[PDB]
Every structure is written in structure tokens, then in C-alpha cells.
Amino acid sequence: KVLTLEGDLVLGGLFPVHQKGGPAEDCGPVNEHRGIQRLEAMLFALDRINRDPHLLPGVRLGAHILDSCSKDTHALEQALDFVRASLSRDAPTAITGVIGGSYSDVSIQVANLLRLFQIPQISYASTSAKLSDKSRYDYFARTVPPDFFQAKAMAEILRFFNWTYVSTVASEGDYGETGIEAFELEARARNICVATSEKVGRAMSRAAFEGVVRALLQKPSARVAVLFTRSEDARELLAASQRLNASFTWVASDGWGALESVVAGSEGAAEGAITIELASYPISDFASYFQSLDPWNNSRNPWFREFWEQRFRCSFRQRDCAAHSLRAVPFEQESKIMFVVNAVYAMAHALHNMHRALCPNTTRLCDAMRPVNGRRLYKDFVLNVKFDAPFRPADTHNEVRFDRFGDGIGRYNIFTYLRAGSGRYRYQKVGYWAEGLTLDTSLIPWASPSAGPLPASRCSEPCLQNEVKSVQPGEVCCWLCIPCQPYEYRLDEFTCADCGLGYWPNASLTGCFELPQEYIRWGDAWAVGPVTIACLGALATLFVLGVFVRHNATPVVKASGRELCYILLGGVFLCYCMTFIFIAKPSTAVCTLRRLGLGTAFSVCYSALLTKTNRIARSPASQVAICLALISGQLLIVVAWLVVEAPGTGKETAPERREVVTLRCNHRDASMLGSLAYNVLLIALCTLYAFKTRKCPENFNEAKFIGFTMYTTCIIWLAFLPIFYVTSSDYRVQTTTMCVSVSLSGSVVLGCLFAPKLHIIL
Amino acid sequence: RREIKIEGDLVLGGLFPINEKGTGTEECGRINEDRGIQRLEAMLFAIDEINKDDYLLPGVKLGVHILDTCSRDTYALEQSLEFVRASLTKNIPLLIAGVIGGSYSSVSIQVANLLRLFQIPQISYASTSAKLSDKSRYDYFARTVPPDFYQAKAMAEILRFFNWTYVSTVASEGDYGETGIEAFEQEARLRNICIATAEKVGRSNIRKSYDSVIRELLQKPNARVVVLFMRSDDSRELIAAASRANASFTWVASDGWGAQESIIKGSEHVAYGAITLELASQPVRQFDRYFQSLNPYNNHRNPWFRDFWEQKFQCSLQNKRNHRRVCDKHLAIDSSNYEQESKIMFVVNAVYAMAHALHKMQRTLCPNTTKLCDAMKILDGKKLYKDYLLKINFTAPFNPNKDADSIVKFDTFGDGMGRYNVFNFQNVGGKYSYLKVGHWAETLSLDVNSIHWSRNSVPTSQCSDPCAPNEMKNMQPGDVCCWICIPCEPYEYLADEFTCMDCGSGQWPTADLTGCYDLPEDYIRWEDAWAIGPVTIACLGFMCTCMVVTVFIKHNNTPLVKASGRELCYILLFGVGLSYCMTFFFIAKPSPVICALRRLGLGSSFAICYSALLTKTNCKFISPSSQVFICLGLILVQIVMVSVWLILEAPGTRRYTLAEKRETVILKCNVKDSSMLISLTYDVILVILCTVYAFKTRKCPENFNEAKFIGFTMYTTCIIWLAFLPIFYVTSSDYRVQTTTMCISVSLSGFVVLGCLFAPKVHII
Ligand SMILES: CC(C)CCC[C@@H](C)[C@H]1CC[C@H]2[C@@H]3CC=C4C[C@@H](O)CC[C@]4(C)[C@H]3CC[C@]12C
Ligand SMILES: CC(C)CCC[C@@H](C)[C@H]1CC[C@H]2[C@@H]3CC=C4C[C@@H](O)CC[C@]4(C)[C@H]3CC[C@]12C
Ligand SMILES: N[C@](CC1c2ccccc2Oc2ccccc21)(C(=O)O)[C@H]1C[C@@H]1C(=O)O
Ligand SMILES: N[C@](CC1c2ccccc2Oc2ccccc21)(C(=O)O)[C@H]1C[C@@H]1C(=O)O
Ligand SMILES: *[C@@H]1O[C@H](CO)[C@@H](O)[C@H](O)[C@H]1NC(C)=O
Ligand SMILES: *[C@@H]1O[C@H](CO)[C@@H](O)[C@H](O)[C@H]1NC(C)=O
């Protein structure tokens, strides 16, 4: 069955006149909207072109239109008829180009078959994304946009509202799978994170849809979902959401559109849904042509009789219908009629351009143009078209042109599901997407203010430098705000790195290098009493030395310990200096000399106290030799001490970060304990030797006082040490107490030594 | 048009280049007597063999529908529509179970593109295009011949076998040469083979572009091996160009060259060690007898046979019988010389593979009878192909020609298994001919003895020898892949395999040249030449100290020099004893404490000199006590200055780039102590000079000898200070001599100052 008519230039056509009826008849009922209306639109466009004195004014366009029965194999068989006209071998009619293909598979098969024979093809309803590659279809053109332009539009919509975390729902077939794939490409090109990706393929019962709804709802951080679903794959999902009481801000595609069959019974679930639909306008001339159609006068169309019989349930044998017509009430213009008209007019314009370029001498089909070269036609005159769309609403945006892939211009209409009426629910065009978004934020139910905005964020707001940005194992893309330790600076997004062992972090927590300074370990407020005591002791020692020098006339100069008194005064001065330097700022060598000075001073006083033991047993030089040997032994033990306890600094004992370092020396506290233990042992030995003395006066005016004071001084020295251990934490208090105790012991020793001189003075 | 139709249960399609490509006037031309007629007769012979066979398709008789493509893709595409017109069910049509593909790659590509829509399996026998291996476009296409990238793989394997990494590649224009050269580039970069030059010869050029290509190849003498994947006429042109020029290259060629004598004609000196690949094939001895027994009268099955007969023998048949010559029974193919085509076994294999697939499908789907049944009437191309064509495993139909790789099977892409023959152009006694030296079925099997070691001596095709980083480094001046050695200094190490790094003065490069190790420390003088030097020096000092101590002990009773000079002599003895410890601390190991003790030794020497000067200042006990206090204060000031210049003693690294050896010597501590030593030594000289001037010797407390002894000792200190002053600056090295000289000088000074003081003690007693 064919409606072909003779013409100088015959144009092919493929329409789904008959719906697919399965294996019973290879095609069933007549398609009254996708096969009849589009075919009549093509016929009307051809008639208008033939009646147009500005487009092909001398050559008459023909038509050779077949029916594909909505199947690929039947389409291939029909396209074989188109092919069998140019072979070098009813009556074949040469076809310059074909305007056919309403299904993606049919168009793909037709393009594959016609590519080998150099026949250009322009489609009107095929939106497959894999028809855009010229490596497989280099003679295929489209007046409709592909299926990824809507994906780009929805990605731009998501970016406009700052929706980064969204849920994705796709279908099982090519439509939905290609859309979702383009969606990840556009999202990763626009930094949009994806929560879930499920499939809602057909032939599934209610349980699958309920499970999908539950999986979507087990994520309260994703309130926006994109639906790459067909009409039947979206109606069931909306019904499941409505019956399960699920609320989402759906961002749908052309599968939903402005159809009212998806929101039937599920108005609550579909509230505030942004939907993308292809932009098109009705043609009044085509409608007027279609109204004045009857089965008696329209003898060109062979399928018109069957269409009339099926639509009105009439029969031409029983004369059931006599006076019927397709008026406004039973007629509704299809949305892709203007695309068919545009395809036909683009083919006519390409033919006119070739006719003008080849033989401009006359406005008639010349002999040179009789052999039509499809390759040159498609490469030059089909792809390079720039003309206003016929029967347009006179808008300047309706311009027909093909891209380098032979695709149409992507122009979609943005729709929303209004509830802002009295009691009626309806759609509204609230923007469009040609190359950029032009939204009308005013109405925008839900997704705009004055109705409750819907944000789509993976997690909380971006964290500051004071907390760790932690990546959740469940949700990788965003990060959570978890405070780190106050002394741990945030080096990067991973975690808070360590500023240092004892270094305070900076304000920005990126480069700190801020080690607190504690050079003044002992405050001047407390470093006054010990200083005054040391000064008084030094003055007393100087006065005693001066008196002893002036006491040469006294009988007790050689028999008495004048050299012993000088040694005791030197030891008192040494311990006073050691206390003064230990109550000062510590240094690397200061700690070593403080221990050495304390030990040497303790040895000097112990040796002076040991002089009574030598006199108790019995030459004056013997006591000097004994004290020198004791001092040498103490010096050697101190030398071994700091050899095993080499000088250093960096005693960061406290990790509380309030005071990381308290100055002091790096030497271990056990080393100080050993020196004090040795000094206490020496003092105990000296006291035992003094108590072991026999009964002899030996200048009892001075011996009794020295013996009474030595025990007290040694007890004070032995009780000073546990003060540090009781606190169990070395600080400025322990140093001051130790210095005060040492100075007091030295002053007491000097006073008891000089008491006979003071007594004899009066 | 003419067609070959034979009735049968199953009809197999066929496309052969019977006629050559059409000229500028007609759509066809002369009959291709070799590629078309011989292959068509091979297909007919195989079909007859299968039909009369007993174990293959016993009940099904195969027919053919053979068409002529005229060596054009458009004509073949138009003709192949007869194959698909019978599967529409919408000049009786004949069902086509399968189509035997064409010879030319474009013809096969177009036929596969048309047949994939109608689900018709296709097996080719001569198509070797890598584009046909794409199952996204040719999912219904198969071939018994391997594609053309297996030749590139074989070339890469051959180059790897002979250790040739720097080679030059020349290709042709079009698609065959392009695909082959890209495949060879992929294989070479997979096997780490450098590409020197990528030259192109185009399609048709005058004999100047070939000379330019030859000169460009000669521009890199390091690459003496040329890889050719290029056609069978441009190869001859390049050989002629290289013959006109004076060049000596080894060629690794493809099936374009092969064993053909057209390439070598007239230029049999340039090509002497060439490696050429050829598709391995075997002659079917039955086909020669079948073709030789063919006559234009008894063979009416082939409509093209009469024209082929009248063209080959240049005679006229019964149409006129007297135009040019009579095609009498005397003229025959048996009498004339006949050579079987190299691609007859491939046609036979394709036909037998299709027959085996049909037989397997018949046994599977239609059992219990050896006849065509209802379930097998319509042919399912997809099922047949994907189940019984890619999964064939059967030996060659005419395998009696002994060969291990006689199995016919297809891989996942439908291509055949690559079995290539490696040839070599060799000499025997002046005769120029090829010789097979190996084969490439799955791995190389070259017979190196037959190759004559690839001409005289094995050719070298490497860009410089491999370079050992242990001794010298490598860089890439202009060539990215290969390298040229550059010497690496012994004091540097190879941190990476391209760049040498320097350890510096801190460490020395390791023997393996993979890092740095702790260089040996400073020279130890304990086991040096002066090992017993300090021991001998201390022995004299110890004896002098013991003698001084004995004299001092004996001085308690009946004092001689202890009359107000006891403190002075004790101080002098203490200084002399401290000098012995000072001269022994110089050899001690480098330590801050060791060098602090060394400086304290000089301080003690200065204190001893000050005390000696104070000895003359005496001329009671209060005044000697004041002098003792004064000299103690002077020593305290000296110690204070020592502590002042002793702050943050650095280790004192030495052995800079001036003397960069394996062993680096360093001082005891920071080398900034030279100024401190110079300042300290000035005090000793100053006090010695003051004592010398103050040695008036105008008073004798006990004897005039003591003043004379003091004056004599004053001169010795000045003499030793002045003599060693030049040695202070000239000796500025860490060698043993510098320290030993100083220690010997100070020990001698300490001995001489103390020796004269002991003389009066012995004389008085
Ligand atoms: C008075 C006479 C007997 C000499 C006594 C020996 C004195 C001077 C010696 C004995 C141990 C020595 C210390 C041992 C180790 C060190 C660490 C080093 O990094 C700096 C020097 C320093 C801190 C030394 C200074 C000098 C020292 C205190
Ligand atoms: C024992 C007492 C009573 C008298 C002798 C004091 C001696 C041992 C003291 C006085 C000055 C001190 C020096 C002062 C400063 C430094 C620099 C330091 O980086 C290492 C220790 C060192 C080199 C000290 C070593 C010990 C020292 C020489
Ligand atoms: N333009 C469509 C788009 C189509 C489609 C649209 C929405 C839902 C499912 C769906 O099925 C697929 C599958 C793959 C590619 C395109 C689609 C075409 O057939 O190509 C279809 C309207 C055209 C028509 O038949 O009139
Ligand atoms: N197998 C070939 C290989 C062929 C070829 C071989 C050598 C030189 C040039 C050349 O042209 C091309 C170009 C592209 C792919 C293959 C080739 C084919 O035509 O496919 C050809 C042997 C088959 C036959 O004609 O008997
Ligand atoms: C999205 O964020 C931008 C700032 O990046 C802001 O200007 C804009 O108003 C936001 N859009 C909303 C909230 O719809
Ligand atoms: C190639 O080099 C390997 C060592 O890497 C050697 O074993 C082999 O024999 C060489 N092949 C030759 C010289 O043909």
C-alpha cells in the first residue's frame, strides 16, 4: 500500500500509520495521531511547497510515502523500495531524499540501510542520542533535539537552585539509561553529587516501586529527585509515593511532560514538580487543512478509509455514517506536526539551493541536476540551512538550522505543577531552555520562597578551619564538621595535623610555628626575698673576712682554723652565688654549674665541719689535706655526674599546652636526686664524726655552738629535699624554696662560726 | 548479467572479482584470470566435494548463487541485493543460508554493512582489513584469513628476537599502510622499541620523493634496520631508489613484498638480508587436476568460462571461429603451465566451514533424520552464526599435506589464526632467490642457520650501548627514548637513573652509587706515626713533677728557696704539672670538652708565666699573700676571658671542596678558636717580656744566683715564644705534624722553665 504520486523530484516518507500488532498481523490498529496526522502534515507541506512561487517555483515535488507498521524489519523492507530506484539495472521512482522515521530503532535501521546508497534522511520524531555520530549515520538529519539536551537543561536547573545532592531514577531501556549516563557526565562537569541510582524497568509489580520509594526515603538529606522515566514508569512511582506518603521535589523529563495521566490519583505526591517538555507551537493552517478532510474527496490517502472506520466506529458497507467531519471537538493537533513541516521545508530548501547553485540559467530541473548526488547534497545544502520556520507565530526564536551532527536546535519548555488555585491543579510554563536558563521565579510553587524552599544538600555547611572535614563512608562527596584538638592545626581537608610538641597553633591553623616563650621562669615579685637574703649573707661574709684579717693580734690565729674560716667563708659565698644563679634564667650550662656549685659548696661546709673530727682524733696541714681530698673527690663525682648527664635544654614536662616548657635543663630529675642524696650522706657522716668526738674543751666557747648548729643545718638540708618530692612537679616554687634553704643554712653556718669573734668583740 | 545458479536444499552466496575494476568508459573490464576465475572454480570444486561427501551434509545438497563484483564496491553492493531479496517473503528467488565474502576489503565492508541488516552470515577468504574486526559494525562477518596487524605483531617479535630497538619505519598512503604502521607503532611501544623516522611514500610519486625518503633514512646511521609495511609497487620503486643511491639497509617487509620477484628485479644488490613475511598456504593437489581438466565445451556451468578461455588463449570461439584464432582442442590448461593461486585453500576452508556450520545446526535442531525438516526451512542467521560458526573445530579439508596447524577455526572476532612464513633473500652460487627461514603461527621459529646470520654479521640497530649508572650517567639531548652516556664524578651518586646527585662534604657516595654513607671520621693520632709521642712527652713531665714534689716535701725542713718564695715555687710546680696534662689533651678525640680542656691548658700556661713574672716582683708574708691574691685574680680574669670566647662550641666541620677525598678530617671543635688562641698567646708573650725587662737583679734575698736563674728562665720563655710565633700561622692544617710540633714546643718550654729552678735546691743542700 502506497500513496505515491509522479513528480520531477520525489521525496520518500516513513510513518507509523499502523501500530505494532505483534506476530498476528505484523501491525495492528491504525495510529490516528502518530501515523495519520503526521502523514497529512507532510502532504499539506508538500502541497504548500508546490504552491509556493518562492521555493522551487519551476520544479514540482513528488511523494513516495510508505508505512513501517511501527517495526524495524518492516521499515527495512519498505526502504528497500526506496533503494530499488537508483540501481543501474510497479515502476521505480527516483528519491532525492526521505522524510521518515518516528521511532529510534526504525530510524536507525533506515539510516543504516540508506547510508550505503547515498540517500539523505531527515527525521521528525526520533530523539535517540546514538544517532548523532557520523561514523555510522552520515546521511541522517534531525529537526528535533537529541535526548541529552534535556539532561543538560536539568543539570543547569539543579545548578541554578544550588541543588548538589539529588536522587536519580532511570529506566531499563535505552531511554533512561542514556539520559542517566548523560546526567552523570553533566553532573561531574558541574560538580553535582548523586545519592542513589535505581532502575524502575517495566513488567515489575508494585513491590519494586515500593522498595525504590523506601530506598529514596532512607535519605532525608536528598529532597530533590530526577526522573528519567517513561509515562508508565513514572505513574507507578508517583502512585507508590502518594500511597506511602512520600514528598519530593521531582525534576522530570519529556517522559512526564505536561501529561495529566501521570498525576491522575497522585496529585499530592506530584506537588511542586519541575518538568521538561519539548517546545512547539500549533499550526493553524494545518488544523484548517485537517478539518476539511472527508473519505470521499481525500482519495490520495489509502489509509484514510481505515482511519475513518476505526475512529468513528463506522463501516462503508453498512452506510452507518453519512455526515461526519473532524471538527475542533474530536481533533487535537499533535506536538510534532511542526517538526514534520520543518523537515519537509528544510529538504525543499536544500533542493532549491542545489537547483540555484547548479544551473542558475533557468528555473527548471536541468539535465545536470537530474543525477542527484546525495553525499554532496547532505554535506553542502542540507546541513547549511538558515530559514524561518513556515507558519511560525512570528517569534524571532523560531529558526530552522542543523548542527554539525545534523541535529535540531534544543528548545524545551519548563513546567511546574501548580496548586496555587481555588480548587484546580494544573501545569504552568515557567521558563524555557534554548541555550541558557530563563526562569520565572515568581510562581515556582515550593521551589521558590513564599511557599517553603526545598534545599538539596548532602550534609551541613562547609566547615571552618577549627574542625576536621571528615568524609562519611556512606556519603563520600561532602564532609562533616567535627572539632579537633585545640593544639592540632588543620593542615588540609584530611584532618588536623600537629602544630608541634609544644607549639601553640596560629589563628589560621595552617602555619603556626608558635612555640611559647618562658624565659622569665621566676617572677621578680617572688625573686626579692632570696636576693635580699643572699646580699645580706654576702655582706656578713665580707664583714667576717675583714674582722678575721684585722684579728691578726688575737692569740687564736695559727692554733685556730683561720684557713678553715676562710674556706668556710668561700663556701658560703659559693653557695650564695649558686642560689642566685639558680634563681635566675636557666641556660644550657647553668643547670650543670648549679649542681656542681651546690655539691662543691656542700663539700666545703662538710669539710669544715669535719675539721672538728680531725681535732677530736688528735699537724694543722693534715686537716687542710683532708678537706682538699674531700673537695677533690666531690669535684670528681660531680664531673662524672655531668658526664653521665650532659648539659641540654628542652624540658617540656607539661603536655597541657598551658605551659609546654618551663625553661630548666634537659637533665633528668633523678640526677638532681642523686646529688642531694650524696650531699645528705656526706652531712650525715660529718654529723656522726662530730658526735663521735671525745670529751675535750677545744675552745668550748666556739665548739659548743658549732656542734649545736651543725645538726640543725644538716637537718634543714635533709628536709629541704623532700619538699620537691612532695609537690611531685618541678616548678619555680621548688627552686626558690631550695635557694632560700641553702642561703639560710649558709647564713646559720657563718653566724655560728663567727659567734666567738662577736662574743670577744664585746 | 551472468549468474551461476545450482538447485539444492541450501544455497550459499558467492562474490568474486571475476572482472577487473571498470575503466573510465565501461563499468567493468577484462576478466581477472587469477583472482576471480580460479577462486570461483575452487568454490565450485569445494561445493561438489561437499555434495558428494558422505560424512558432511549426507542428505542436504548445497547450491550456489555466485555473483560478479567487477572489483568495485558499488557494483558489489548493487549485486548483493539479490541475496537479500529472497528473505523478504512479501527469476525465482533462492534462499541464501550464507554468503562467501569478496576479496577486496572495501567490497567486503560494503557487503557486510548491507548483510548485517538482514541477518545473513558472511565468511571471507581474502579480506585482511582491521576495520572488519569491529563487531559493533560487522557482527555478521567472518574470515578464514588473519587481519593485517598480525603481520605488525610478527615484525615486532622478529625485531625483539634480534635485539633491534632503534629502527626506521616506512609506510604507504591509503588505509592498509596506515593501519599497518599504526599497529606496528603500538606493538613497538609495547615492546620498548624506538622509532627513528616515520617516512611516507604516498601513492604515486616521481622518482624523487623515493630518493628523499632514502636520504632521510640514511640521515640516522644508528638505525640500520628498515621496517616496511607498504604496497607491492611502491616497494619496487623504493628498492630502485635505494639501488640508484649507495645504501646498505636490512628490510623487514610485509606481505606486500613477500616472495615476489617483481620487487627484486634489476636491483639485486640492495636487498640481500631482507626479512619478508608471507601468508602461509598449501596447494590443494585436487584443485590443479580439477582446473586442468576444464574445457569450454564440457563446462557450461560457468558463464564466464568461455570469455576467460577466449581471452587467455587469444582465440575466438564458435561465435565467429575465424576472427583471430581457433580455440581448438589442442589448446588446454593441462598442456599449458599452470600455477595454483595462493588463496585457494582459504576459499576451500571458508566453504567447508559454512558446510560444517550447516551440518552442526542440522544435527542439533533437526535430529533423527538426515533431511531438511520444517524446523530448519527458514535459516536463522544470528543463531547459526553465533552458535555454529565462531565455534568450529575441524581439520583442513585437504590436510594430507602434512602440517600441524591444519585446524580451521575462528576467534571471538571471527578472524582466522595468523600463520605467516618468514623468508630471506639469499645467495647460493650467484643465483638470486628467496628461502623460507621460519614461520609465525603463535611464536617465532626462525632457523638462524638458514638466515646466514642476517647478512654478514648480525646487524646492529641499537641507539648506543646500555649505560651503567655505577660509573657514568646518561642524558637525552635530542632523542627521547635512547640515551648517551655522560661520566659521573666519583664524589657524586646516582639518586635517579638519569641524574647524578652529590652527597656533599657531609657524606660520601656509596659503592653501589645508590645513596650516601657516613664518611670516615677525622684521622686518629693514637695509632698514627707519633703513637708514642704523647707517652714519651708525659714521661719527662711526670718525672719532672715527681722531682718537684720531692724537692717541695724536702723543703719543709731547713728551707732554702721557701723563704717567702714557697707559694711562688708551688705555683710554678703546679703550672709545670698542668702543662703535662695540657700537652696530652691535644691528641684526645674531637670533643667540645676536650678542646675546652686544651684551651684551659693554654690558660694555665699563661697563669704559670704570670706567676713566674710575679716571682721577680717580690724584690714577710702579707706582701707574698698580696702577690698570690693578685696572680689569682689574673688567672680568674684569664678564665673569664676563656669563658667569654667559649660560647656555643660548634663541631667545626672541615675538608671543604678544596680537598675532597674519601676521608675527611675535622678539628676538635669550631675552627673559630684561632683568634682566641692568638689572643691568649699574646698574654704569655707580654708577661714574659715584662718579666725580662723587670729582671734587674739588683737585689739578692739569699743569693745572686736566684736572680740570675730567674733572668735565664725569662729568656727561655721569650725564645720559645718568638721561635714558635711563625709556626702559629704557617701550620694551619689538621695533619699530625701541626699538633705534634706545638705539643713538643710547649713541653720543651715547660721543661726548660722548671729545670733551672731545681738547680739551686741541690746546690744549697
Ligand atoms: C677544676 C679542674 C680540676 C677541672 C675540672 C673539670 C671541668 C672543667 C670539666 C669536667 C667536665 C666538663 C664538662 C663535660 C661535658 C661538657 C659538655 C660539652 O657539650 C660542653 C662542655 C662540658 C659542659 C664540659 C665543661 C668542662 C667540665 C665541667
Ligand atoms: C669549681 C669552681 C668553684 C671553680 C671552677 C669553675 C669552672 C669549673 C667553671 C667556671 C666557668 C665554667 C664554664 C662557663 C661556660 C661554659 C660554656 C658552656 O657551653 C660549656 C661549659 C663551660 C665551658 C663552663 C665549664 C665550667 C667552668 C670552666
Ligand atoms: N522521540 C521519541 C523519544 C522516545 C521516548 C520518549 C519518552 C519516553 C520513552 C521514549 O522511548 C525512546 C527510547 C529511545 C529513544 C527515544 C525514545 C523517539 O521515538 O525517538 C518518541 C517520541 C517519538 C515518537 O515516537 O513520536
Ligand atoms: N587482503 C587484501 C589485502 C590488501 C592489500 C595487500 C597488499 C597491498 C595492498 C593492499 O590493499 C589493501 C587495503 C586495505 C586492506 C587490505 C588490502 C584485501 O584486499 O583485503 C588483498 C589480498 C586480497 C586480494 O585482493 O586477494
Ligand atoms: C545559589 O547560590 C548563589 C551563590 O553561589 C546565590 O547567589 C543564589 O541566590 C542561590 N540560589 C538560590 C538560593 O536559589
Ligand atoms: C638478545 O639479548 C639477550 C640478552 O638480553 C641474549 O640472551 C640473546 O641471545 C640476544 N639475541 C640475539 C643476539 O640474537
Overview of this protein structure:
The complex is a heterodimer of chains A (762) and B (765). Chain A is α/β, with parallel strands linked by helices and 762 residues long. Chain A has a domain at 147-281 and 412-439: Response regulator (Rossmann fold, 3-Layer(aba) Sandwich). Chain A has helices spanning 36-50, 72-83, 104-115, 149-160, 174-188, 206-217, 231-243, 284-291, 304-312, 337-358, 374-382, 529-550, 562-582, 590-617, 620-644, 669-691, 700-727, 732-761; strands at residues 9-15, 61-67, 95-100, 121-123, 140-142, 165-170, 193-199, 224-228, 249-252, 274-278, 387-388, 399-400, 412-418, 426-433, 437-439, 467-470, 480-483, 488-489, 497-498. In chain A, the strands form five sheets. Chain A has an eight-stranded mixed beta sheet with strand order 7-6-8-9-10-13-14-15, sandwiched between helices. A five-stranded parallel beta sheet of chain A has the order 2-1-3-4-5, sandwiched between helices. In chain A, helix 2 packs parallel to helix 3 (104-115) and helix 13 runs antiparallel to helix 18 (732-761). Chain A is rod-shaped, with a radius of gyration of 53 Å. With 765 residues, chain B is α/β, with parallel strands linked by helices. Chain B folds into four domains: 4-145 and 343-408, Rossmann fold, CATH 3.40.50; 149-282 and 419-440, Response regulator (Rossmann fold, 3-Layer(aba) Sandwich); 295-332, no CATH class; 533-764, Rhodopsin 7-helix transmembrane proteins (Rhopdopsin 7-helix transmembrane proteins), CATH 1.20.1070. Helix content of chain B is 40%, strand content 13%. Chain B contains 19 helices and 23 strands. The radius of gyration of chain B is 53 Å and the shape is rod-shaped. Classes of the chains: A alpha/beta (762), B alpha/beta (765). Chains A and B meet through helix 2 and helix 3 of A and helix 4 of B. The complex binds cholesterol (CLR) (2 copies), the ligand N[C@](CC1c2ccccc2Oc2ccccc21)(C(=O)O)[C@H]1C[C@@H]1C(=O)O (2 copies) and 2-acetamido-2-deoxy-beta-D-glucopyranose (NAG) (2 copies). One copy of the ligand N[C@](CC1c2ccccc2Oc2ccccc21)(C(=O)O)[C@H]1C[C@@H]1C(=O)O binds at residues 35, 103-105, 126-129, 175-176, 231-232, 255-256, 343 of chain B. Chain B: It comes from Homo sapiens (Human). Chain B: Belongs to the G-protein coupled receptor 3 family. Chain B: The chain crosses the membrane at residues 531-553, 568-588, 600-618, 628-648, 674-695, 709-731, 742-765. Chain B: Residues 1-530, 589-599, 649-673, 732-741 are extracellular.
